[PDB]
């Protein structure tokens, strides 16, 4: 029978999308999240999946037992300590666990607790720090990953006391392959004041580029350090526009900066770069800002999918 998957801290459902891509015999029995905005997006894309809009800390052991899950997929931002407290009390321990977190987690106290708990329960595990660029995706998103399997023999690729920086046994695609034809360029052009203020601090990429900076939840609202911006103007070079800036009045610098036709990648384009399927979308009521915020909290579906494949077989 198919594995019963519990999806905690579900968000827009990146774990569920990764589960479907992995092709393994499994189905999400319960997705859990308190955020009503994330949940409307999740339900919209996964209308037949049980979604529990509840605090994870408030879920009792009985509720977890009734779910009878064989795999936990989670991206914890208390609720986490509760999960750890619940594990040794479950009538049926899940055979699989996959956790995603941020760089630095691998040295944290919380991580030390997680590993102690899972080791005490008989799980073989391996930690990783992976970015989508390792899979030929032109977008950086270095994240922590822990895969664990309930068995006696170590995973074949195990490296004790080490965090693996690559997938166990790239040719990067261009950004053009992830752009949407129907993108309303004018709508996404960076505004004048933002161009001038952040002019020298932008990471400008062209469609033929095979890299882009990590997108944060603030992308599209805050300029600096939140993700690359796209040059849509052809037959103009960034270098020539920037050379022209010294000695021009601020209004003149803006005129020059607008020529590059720099625009934000759209929420759908970020979802594409994150590996979300073609049909993935958002309800009309979800604002562009909410879309960027939700995607910023999500994960790269392709990376997790490959890790699920590794963990399962
Ligand atoms: N105590 C808690 N109970 C339930 N959900 C929680 C929670 N604390 C955080 N969350 C949710 O966990 C998420 C952390 S972001 C995880 C996003 C998800 N991996 C994705 O594919 O979108 C947020 O959606 C947040 O609302």
mmCIF file of C-alpha atoms and ligand atoms in Angstrom:
data_model
loop_
_atom_site.group_PDB
_atom_site.id
_atom_site.type_symbol
_atom_site.label_atom_id
_atom_site.label_comp_id
_atom_site.label_asym_id
_atom_site.label_seq_id
_atom_site.Cartn_x
_atom_site.Cartn_y
_atom_site.Cartn_z
ATOM 1 C CA UNK A 1 0.000 0.000 0.000
ATOM 2 C CA UNK A 2 1.240 3.599 -0.600
ATOM 3 C CA UNK A 3 3.153 5.397 2.134
ATOM 4 C CA UNK A 4 1.064 7.753 4.237
ATOM 5 C CA UNK A 5 2.832 11.128 4.187
ATOM 6 C CA UNK A 6 2.437 13.808 6.863
ATOM 7 C CA UNK A 7 3.359 17.271 5.502
ATOM 8 C CA UNK A 8 4.113 19.694 8.364
ATOM 9 C CA UNK A 9 4.533 23.454 7.936
ATOM 10 C CA UNK A 10 2.997 22.873 4.511
ATOM 11 C CA UNK A 11 2.893 26.451 3.130
ATOM 12 C CA UNK A 12 2.135 26.439 -0.645
ATOM 13 C CA UNK A 13 2.958 22.713 -0.680
ATOM 14 C CA UNK A 14 6.518 22.477 -1.951
ATOM 15 C CA UNK A 15 6.977 19.122 -0.141
ATOM 16 C CA UNK A 16 3.830 17.713 -1.725
ATOM 17 C CA UNK A 17 4.970 18.860 -5.187
ATOM 18 C CA UNK A 18 8.372 17.215 -4.504
ATOM 19 C CA UNK A 19 6.637 13.998 -3.407
ATOM 20 C CA UNK A 20 4.715 13.820 -6.700
ATOM 21 C CA UNK A 21 7.894 14.443 -8.744
ATOM 22 C CA UNK A 22 9.842 11.728 -6.851
ATOM 23 C CA UNK A 23 7.425 9.112 -8.330
ATOM 24 C CA UNK A 24 7.497 7.051 -5.100
ATOM 25 C CA UNK A 25 4.291 5.160 -3.983
ATOM 26 C CA UNK A 26 3.041 7.714 -1.487
ATOM 27 C CA UNK A 27 0.284 10.145 -0.810
ATOM 28 C CA UNK A 28 -0.118 13.085 1.594
ATOM 29 C CA UNK A 29 -2.589 12.096 4.310
ATOM 30 C CA UNK A 30 -2.351 15.419 6.138
ATOM 31 C CA UNK A 31 -0.819 18.797 5.370
ATOM 32 C CA UNK A 32 -0.613 21.139 8.431
ATOM 33 C CA UNK A 33 -0.197 24.935 8.634
ATOM 34 C CA UNK A 34 -1.848 27.852 10.556
ATOM 35 C CA UNK A 35 -1.340 30.509 7.878
ATOM 36 C CA UNK A 36 -4.723 31.038 6.203
ATOM 37 C CA UNK A 37 -3.131 32.689 3.165
ATOM 38 C CA UNK A 38 -0.745 29.763 2.552
ATOM 39 C CA UNK A 39 -3.672 27.354 3.073
ATOM 40 C CA UNK A 40 -5.872 29.010 0.418
ATOM 41 C CA UNK A 41 -2.993 28.498 -2.059
ATOM 42 C CA UNK A 42 -2.395 24.919 -0.900
ATOM 43 C CA UNK A 43 -6.145 23.988 -1.171
ATOM 44 C CA UNK A 44 -6.393 25.727 -4.524
ATOM 45 C CA UNK A 45 -3.663 23.457 -5.970
ATOM 46 C CA UNK A 46 -4.400 20.357 -3.836
ATOM 47 C CA UNK A 47 -8.205 20.342 -3.409
ATOM 48 C CA UNK A 48 -8.331 16.630 -2.439
ATOM 49 C CA UNK A 49 -5.676 16.697 0.286
ATOM 50 C CA UNK A 50 -6.638 16.936 3.935
ATOM 51 C CA UNK A 51 -5.414 20.297 5.255
ATOM 52 C CA UNK A 52 -5.336 20.975 8.974
ATOM 53 C CA UNK A 53 -5.303 24.701 9.809
ATOM 54 C CA UNK A 54 -3.997 24.138 13.338
ATOM 55 C CA UNK A 55 -0.936 24.843 15.448
ATOM 56 C CA UNK A 56 1.430 21.851 15.271
ATOM 57 C CA UNK A 57 2.065 22.201 19.028
ATOM 58 C CA UNK A 58 -1.615 21.664 19.711
ATOM 59 C CA UNK A 59 -1.858 18.332 17.884
ATOM 60 C CA UNK A 60 -2.202 15.475 20.429
ATOM 61 C CA UNK A 61 -0.529 12.069 20.127
ATOM 62 C CA UNK A 62 -3.925 10.513 19.400
ATOM 63 C CA UNK A 63 -4.390 12.773 16.386
ATOM 64 C CA UNK A 64 -0.899 11.859 15.136
ATOM 65 C CA UNK A 65 -1.639 8.169 15.751
ATOM 66 C CA UNK A 66 -4.897 8.358 13.802
ATOM 67 C CA UNK A 67 -2.919 9.736 10.831
ATOM 68 C CA UNK A 68 -0.671 6.636 10.915
ATOM 69 C CA UNK A 69 2.016 8.220 8.802
ATOM 70 C CA UNK A 70 5.031 6.437 7.308
ATOM 71 C CA UNK A 71 6.933 9.567 6.258
ATOM 72 C CA UNK A 72 7.329 13.075 7.646
ATOM 73 C CA UNK A 73 8.220 15.918 5.261
ATOM 74 C CA UNK A 74 8.801 19.195 7.057
ATOM 75 C CA UNK A 75 10.245 22.736 6.835
ATOM 76 C CA UNK A 76 10.083 24.099 10.408
ATOM 77 C CA UNK A 77 10.581 27.924 10.439
ATOM 78 C CA UNK A 78 8.016 24.573 20.378
ATOM 79 C CA UNK A 79 5.996 23.066 17.494
ATOM 80 C CA UNK A 80 9.259 21.388 16.437
ATOM 81 C CA UNK A 81 10.120 20.257 19.974
ATOM 82 C CA UNK A 82 6.601 18.826 20.185
ATOM 83 C CA UNK A 83 7.178 16.760 17.014
ATOM 84 C CA UNK A 84 10.369 15.520 18.630
ATOM 85 C CA UNK A 85 8.467 14.715 21.832
ATOM 86 C CA UNK A 86 5.730 12.889 19.914
ATOM 87 C CA UNK A 87 8.033 10.642 17.872
ATOM 88 C CA UNK A 88 8.946 8.099 20.647
ATOM 89 C CA UNK A 89 5.270 7.871 21.700
ATOM 90 C CA UNK A 90 3.746 7.134 18.295
ATOM 91 C CA UNK A 91 2.121 3.715 17.948
ATOM 92 C CA UNK A 92 3.921 3.447 14.566
ATOM 93 C CA UNK A 93 7.212 5.234 13.973
ATOM 94 C CA UNK A 94 7.432 6.770 10.513
ATOM 95 C CA UNK A 95 9.975 4.891 8.354
ATOM 96 C CA UNK A 96 11.042 8.134 6.655
ATOM 97 C CA UNK A 97 11.829 11.711 7.635
ATOM 98 C CA UNK A 98 12.926 14.592 5.426
ATOM 99 C CA UNK A 99 13.576 18.008 6.913
ATOM 100 C CA UNK A 100 14.546 21.225 5.215
ATOM 101 C CA UNK A 101 16.045 24.238 6.982
ATOM 102 C CA UNK A 102 18.513 27.102 6.465
ATOM 103 C CA UNK A 103 22.319 27.203 6.321
ATOM 104 C CA UNK A 104 23.614 27.274 9.896
ATOM 105 C CA UNK A 105 20.982 24.915 11.299
ATOM 106 C CA UNK A 106 23.508 22.071 10.997
ATOM 107 C CA UNK A 107 25.490 23.483 13.945
ATOM 108 C CA UNK A 108 22.496 24.516 16.120
ATOM 109 C CA UNK A 109 21.249 23.113 19.424
ATOM 110 C CA UNK A 110 17.847 22.315 17.892
ATOM 111 C CA UNK A 111 19.655 20.153 15.301
ATOM 112 C CA UNK A 112 21.524 18.362 18.109
ATOM 113 C CA UNK A 113 18.157 17.469 19.729
ATOM 114 C CA UNK A 114 16.691 16.260 16.424
ATOM 115 C CA UNK A 115 19.682 13.963 15.779
ATOM 116 C CA UNK A 116 19.671 12.602 19.353
ATOM 117 C CA UNK A 117 15.940 11.843 19.097
ATOM 118 C CA UNK A 118 16.201 10.117 15.734
ATOM 119 C CA UNK A 119 19.318 8.189 16.635
ATOM 120 C CA UNK A 120 17.592 6.932 19.840
ATOM 121 C CA UNK A 121 14.697 5.786 17.691
ATOM 122 C CA UNK A 122 16.886 3.778 15.298
ATOM 123 C CA UNK A 123 17.039 6.100 12.296
ATOM 124 C CA UNK A 124 19.969 6.155 9.870
ATOM 125 C CA UNK A 125 20.404 9.702 8.543
ATOM 126 C CA UNK A 126 22.557 11.991 6.437
ATOM 127 C CA UNK A 127 22.646 15.805 6.436
ATOM 128 C CA UNK A 128 23.150 17.952 3.338
ATOM 129 C CA UNK A 129 23.610 21.606 2.308
ATOM 130 C CA UNK A 130 22.375 21.744 -1.312
ATOM 131 C CA UNK A 131 21.533 24.422 -3.886
ATOM 132 C CA UNK A 132 19.461 24.016 -7.091
ATOM 133 C CA UNK A 133 22.545 24.879 -9.144
ATOM 134 C CA UNK A 134 23.736 21.303 -8.470
ATOM 135 C CA UNK A 135 20.792 20.187 -10.630
ATOM 136 C CA UNK A 136 21.387 22.629 -13.492
ATOM 137 C CA UNK A 137 18.835 25.163 -12.256
ATOM 138 C CA UNK A 138 20.096 28.773 -12.716
ATOM 139 C CA UNK A 139 19.157 29.898 -9.204
ATOM 140 C CA UNK A 140 20.982 29.808 -5.907
ATOM 141 C CA UNK A 141 19.107 28.554 -2.837
ATOM 142 C CA UNK A 142 21.508 26.876 -0.449
ATOM 143 C CA UNK A 143 19.446 24.976 2.131
ATOM 144 C CA UNK A 144 19.981 22.389 4.856
ATOM 145 C CA UNK A 145 18.432 18.940 4.389
ATOM 146 C CA UNK A 146 18.262 15.940 6.664
ATOM 147 C CA UNK A 147 17.030 12.602 5.312
ATOM 148 C CA UNK A 148 16.420 9.719 7.763
ATOM 149 C CA UNK A 149 15.334 6.126 7.253
ATOM 150 C CA UNK A 150 14.251 3.617 9.870
ATOM 151 C CA UNK A 151 16.581 0.673 9.270
ATOM 152 C CA UNK A 152 19.704 -0.971 10.703
ATOM 153 C CA UNK A 153 22.210 -0.570 7.865
ATOM 154 C CA UNK A 154 23.554 2.924 7.067
ATOM 155 C CA UNK A 155 22.536 4.644 3.840
ATOM 156 C CA UNK A 156 25.129 3.574 1.192
ATOM 157 C CA UNK A 157 26.414 7.146 0.640
ATOM 158 C CA UNK A 158 26.649 7.967 4.329
ATOM 159 C CA UNK A 159 29.483 10.206 5.519
ATOM 160 C CA UNK A 160 29.427 10.072 9.372
ATOM 161 C CA UNK A 161 29.873 13.395 11.140
ATOM 162 C CA UNK A 162 29.694 15.253 7.834
ATOM 163 C CA UNK A 163 27.301 17.452 5.907
ATOM 164 C CA UNK A 164 27.306 16.531 2.197
ATOM 165 C CA UNK A 165 27.599 19.459 -0.221
ATOM 166 C CA UNK A 166 26.502 17.529 -3.301
ATOM 167 C CA UNK A 167 23.923 14.911 -4.251
ATOM 168 C CA UNK A 168 25.248 11.327 -3.822
ATOM 169 C CA UNK A 169 26.092 9.849 -7.271
ATOM 170 C CA UNK A 170 25.345 19.751 -13.976
ATOM 171 C CA UNK A 171 25.088 21.706 -17.278
ATOM 172 C CA UNK A 172 23.064 24.734 -16.069
ATOM 173 C CA UNK A 173 19.985 25.843 -18.009
ATOM 174 C CA UNK A 174 19.562 29.480 -19.027
ATOM 175 C CA UNK A 175 17.069 31.692 -17.249
ATOM 176 C CA UNK A 176 15.133 32.070 -20.521
ATOM 177 C CA UNK A 177 13.663 28.591 -20.046
ATOM 178 C CA UNK A 178 11.907 29.667 -16.885
ATOM 179 C CA UNK A 179 10.459 32.994 -18.115
ATOM 180 C CA UNK A 180 6.770 33.362 -18.967
ATOM 181 C CA UNK A 181 5.784 34.544 -22.454
ATOM 182 C CA UNK A 182 2.685 36.264 -21.133
ATOM 183 C CA UNK A 183 4.591 38.296 -18.546
ATOM 184 C CA UNK A 184 3.338 41.876 -18.552
ATOM 185 C CA UNK A 185 6.774 43.557 -18.647
ATOM 186 C CA UNK A 186 5.496 47.084 -17.868
ATOM 187 C CA UNK A 187 3.834 45.822 -14.641
ATOM 188 C CA UNK A 188 7.126 44.405 -13.326
ATOM 189 C CA UNK A 189 9.596 47.120 -14.362
ATOM 190 C CA UNK A 190 11.568 48.403 -11.367
ATOM 191 C CA UNK A 191 10.326 51.940 -10.519
ATOM 192 C CA UNK A 192 12.528 55.108 -11.005
ATOM 193 C CA UNK A 193 13.335 55.925 -7.395
ATOM 194 C CA UNK A 194 14.299 52.319 -6.675
ATOM 195 C CA UNK A 195 16.616 52.250 -9.725
ATOM 196 C CA UNK A 196 18.434 55.394 -8.644
ATOM 197 C CA UNK A 197 18.782 54.544 -4.949
ATOM 198 C CA UNK A 198 19.871 50.925 -5.491
ATOM 199 C CA UNK A 199 21.530 51.417 -8.902
ATOM 200 C CA UNK A 200 24.997 50.161 -7.851
ATOM 201 C CA UNK A 201 23.636 47.390 -5.610
ATOM 202 C CA UNK A 202 21.557 45.445 -8.156
ATOM 203 C CA UNK A 203 22.344 41.975 -9.450
ATOM 204 C CA UNK A 204 21.383 42.304 -13.084
ATOM 205 C CA UNK A 205 20.934 39.212 -15.199
ATOM 206 C CA UNK A 206 19.962 38.721 -18.859
ATOM 207 C CA UNK A 207 17.768 35.847 -20.188
ATOM 208 C CA UNK A 208 20.837 33.993 -21.475
ATOM 209 C CA UNK A 209 22.413 33.955 -18.004
ATOM 210 C CA UNK A 210 22.663 30.676 -16.071
ATOM 211 C CA UNK A 211 22.654 32.065 -12.495
ATOM 212 C CA UNK A 212 20.523 34.236 -10.222
ATOM 213 C CA UNK A 213 20.721 35.152 -6.559
ATOM 214 C CA UNK A 214 18.550 33.520 -3.894
ATOM 215 C CA UNK A 215 15.012 34.980 -3.770
ATOM 216 C CA UNK A 216 13.853 35.989 -0.290
ATOM 217 C CA UNK A 217 10.330 36.708 0.896
ATOM 218 C CA UNK A 218 10.955 40.423 0.476
ATOM 219 C CA UNK A 219 11.645 40.179 -3.295
ATOM 220 C CA UNK A 220 9.567 42.607 -5.326
ATOM 221 C CA UNK A 221 9.154 45.011 -2.368
ATOM 222 C CA UNK A 222 12.648 45.471 -0.985
ATOM 223 C CA UNK A 223 15.375 45.773 -3.577
ATOM 224 C CA UNK A 224 18.771 45.064 -2.046
ATOM 225 C CA UNK A 225 19.777 41.462 -1.320
ATOM 226 C CA UNK A 226 16.442 39.859 -2.159
ATOM 227 C CA UNK A 227 17.052 38.414 -5.631
ATOM 228 C CA UNK A 228 18.254 39.264 -9.124
ATOM 229 C CA UNK A 229 16.456 41.644 -11.455
ATOM 230 C CA UNK A 230 16.068 40.950 -15.170
ATOM 231 C CA UNK A 231 17.287 43.142 -18.064
ATOM 232 C CA UNK A 232 14.623 42.930 -20.773
ATOM 233 C CA UNK A 233 16.022 45.664 -23.052
ATOM 234 C CA UNK A 234 17.963 44.282 -25.936
ATOM 235 C CA UNK A 235 20.806 45.976 -27.766
ATOM 236 C CA UNK A 236 22.002 47.903 -24.677
ATOM 237 C CA UNK A 237 24.779 46.978 -22.227
ATOM 238 C CA UNK A 238 24.705 47.447 -18.486
ATOM 239 C CA UNK A 239 28.343 48.593 -18.586
ATOM 240 C CA UNK A 240 27.593 51.433 -21.021
ATOM 241 C CA UNK A 241 24.585 52.630 -19.052
ATOM 242 C CA UNK A 242 26.590 52.601 -15.839
ATOM 243 C CA UNK A 243 29.548 54.414 -17.457
ATOM 244 C CA UNK A 244 27.119 57.199 -18.397
ATOM 245 C CA UNK A 245 26.061 57.822 -14.764
ATOM 246 C CA UNK A 246 29.014 59.800 -13.378
ATOM 247 C CA UNK A 247 28.401 63.486 -14.024
ATOM 248 C CA UNK A 248 24.652 63.267 -14.750
ATOM 249 C CA UNK A 249 21.876 64.818 -12.668
ATOM 250 C CA UNK A 250 19.712 62.411 -10.710
ATOM 251 C CA UNK A 251 16.838 62.857 -13.203
ATOM 252 C CA UNK A 252 19.354 62.124 -15.993
ATOM 253 C CA UNK A 253 20.666 58.998 -14.196
ATOM 254 C CA UNK A 254 17.068 57.740 -13.900
ATOM 255 C CA UNK A 255 16.548 58.288 -17.651
ATOM 256 C CA UNK A 256 19.657 56.197 -18.337
ATOM 257 C CA UNK A 257 18.663 53.510 -15.825
ATOM 258 C CA UNK A 258 15.174 53.098 -17.306
ATOM 259 C CA UNK A 259 16.737 52.164 -20.697
ATOM 260 C CA UNK A 260 17.818 48.735 -19.351
ATOM 261 C CA UNK A 261 14.140 47.867 -18.829
ATOM 262 C CA UNK A 262 14.980 46.001 -15.664
ATOM 263 C CA UNK A 263 12.034 44.026 -14.276
ATOM 264 C CA UNK A 264 11.308 41.689 -11.393
ATOM 265 C CA UNK A 265 10.946 37.998 -12.116
ATOM 266 C CA UNK A 266 7.219 37.337 -11.577
ATOM 267 C CA UNK A 267 5.889 35.055 -8.775
ATOM 268 C CA UNK A 268 5.109 32.421 -11.444
ATOM 269 C CA UNK A 269 8.665 32.674 -12.799
ATOM 270 C CA UNK A 270 10.094 32.214 -9.293
ATOM 271 C CA UNK A 271 7.785 29.161 -8.873
ATOM 272 C CA UNK A 272 9.163 27.880 -12.227
ATOM 273 C CA UNK A 273 12.753 28.365 -10.970
ATOM 274 C CA UNK A 274 11.726 26.559 -7.757
ATOM 275 C CA UNK A 275 10.556 23.602 -9.830
ATOM 276 C CA UNK A 276 6.807 23.991 -9.314
ATOM 277 C CA UNK A 277 4.719 22.281 -12.015
ATOM 278 C CA UNK A 278 3.203 24.134 -14.998
ATOM 279 C CA UNK A 279 -0.316 24.234 -13.509
ATOM 280 C CA UNK A 280 0.833 25.683 -10.220
ATOM 281 C CA UNK A 281 -0.950 28.941 -9.599
ATOM 282 C CA UNK A 282 -2.482 31.256 -7.016
ATOM 283 C CA UNK A 283 -6.077 32.269 -6.245
ATOM 284 C CA UNK A 284 -6.959 35.716 -7.816
ATOM 285 C CA UNK A 285 -7.344 37.227 -4.337
ATOM 286 C CA UNK A 286 -3.716 36.519 -3.352
ATOM 287 C CA UNK A 287 -1.723 39.711 -3.904
ATOM 288 C CA UNK A 288 1.528 39.813 -5.816
ATOM 289 C CA UNK A 289 3.214 40.721 -2.528
ATOM 290 C CA UNK A 290 1.723 37.683 -0.774
ATOM 291 C CA UNK A 291 2.845 35.538 -3.712
ATOM 292 C CA UNK A 292 6.461 36.673 -3.361
ATOM 293 C CA UNK A 293 6.248 36.195 0.432
ATOM 294 C CA UNK A 294 4.877 32.610 0.084
ATOM 295 C CA UNK A 295 7.421 31.597 -2.591
ATOM 296 C CA UNK A 296 10.203 33.123 -0.520
ATOM 297 C CA UNK A 297 9.276 30.726 2.319
ATOM 298 C CA UNK A 298 9.011 27.735 -0.024
ATOM 299 C CA UNK A 299 11.652 25.354 -1.319
ATOM 300 C CA UNK A 300 13.055 24.015 -4.544
ATOM 301 C CA UNK A 301 10.807 21.162 -5.547
ATOM 302 C CA UNK A 302 13.464 19.512 -7.777
ATOM 303 C CA UNK A 303 16.114 19.302 -5.013
ATOM 304 C CA UNK A 304 13.732 17.801 -2.444
ATOM 305 C CA UNK A 305 12.335 15.406 -5.081
ATOM 306 C CA UNK A 306 15.807 14.085 -5.829
ATOM 307 C CA UNK A 307 16.490 13.665 -2.103
ATOM 308 C CA UNK A 308 13.195 11.762 -1.691
ATOM 309 C CA UNK A 309 14.302 9.471 -4.542
ATOM 310 C CA UNK A 310 17.647 8.938 -2.730
ATOM 311 C CA UNK A 311 15.992 8.221 0.629
ATOM 312 C CA UNK A 312 13.397 5.787 -0.742
ATOM 313 C CA UNK A 313 15.399 3.434 -2.898
HETATM 314 N N1 LIG B 1 3.293 26.295 15.042
HETATM 315 C C1 LIG B 1 2.947 26.207 13.744
HETATM 316 N N2 LIG B 1 1.858 25.493 13.413
HETATM 317 C C2 LIG B 1 1.539 25.375 12.114
HETATM 318 N N3 LIG B 1 2.138 25.890 11.046
HETATM 319 C C3 LIG B 1 3.208 26.614 11.397
HETATM 320 C C4 LIG B 1 3.670 26.820 12.696
HETATM 321 N N4 LIG B 1 4.805 27.611 12.678
HETATM 322 C C5 LIG B 1 5.001 27.877 11.410
HETATM 323 N N5 LIG B 1 4.069 27.308 10.579
HETATM 324 C C6 LIG B 1 4.040 27.422 9.122
HETATM 325 O O1 LIG B 1 5.184 26.782 8.617
HETATM 326 C C7 LIG B 1 5.646 27.455 7.418
HETATM 327 C C8 LIG B 1 7.130 27.682 7.516
HETATM 328 S S1 LIG B 1 7.527 27.987 5.769
HETATM 329 C C9 LIG B 1 7.308 26.315 5.065
HETATM 330 C C10 LIG B 1 6.854 26.448 3.620
HETATM 331 C C11 LIG B 1 6.661 25.134 2.851
HETATM 332 N N6 LIG B 1 7.804 24.239 2.870
HETATM 333 C C12 LIG B 1 6.448 25.468 1.376
HETATM 334 O O2 LIG B 1 6.603 24.605 0.403
HETATM 335 O O3 LIG B 1 5.756 26.546 1.153
HETATM 336 C C13 LIG B 1 4.773 28.700 7.257
HETATM 337 O O4 LIG B 1 3.763 28.486 6.278
HETATM 338 C C14 LIG B 1 4.145 28.875 8.636
HETATM 339 O O5 LIG B 1 2.863 29.469 8.562
#
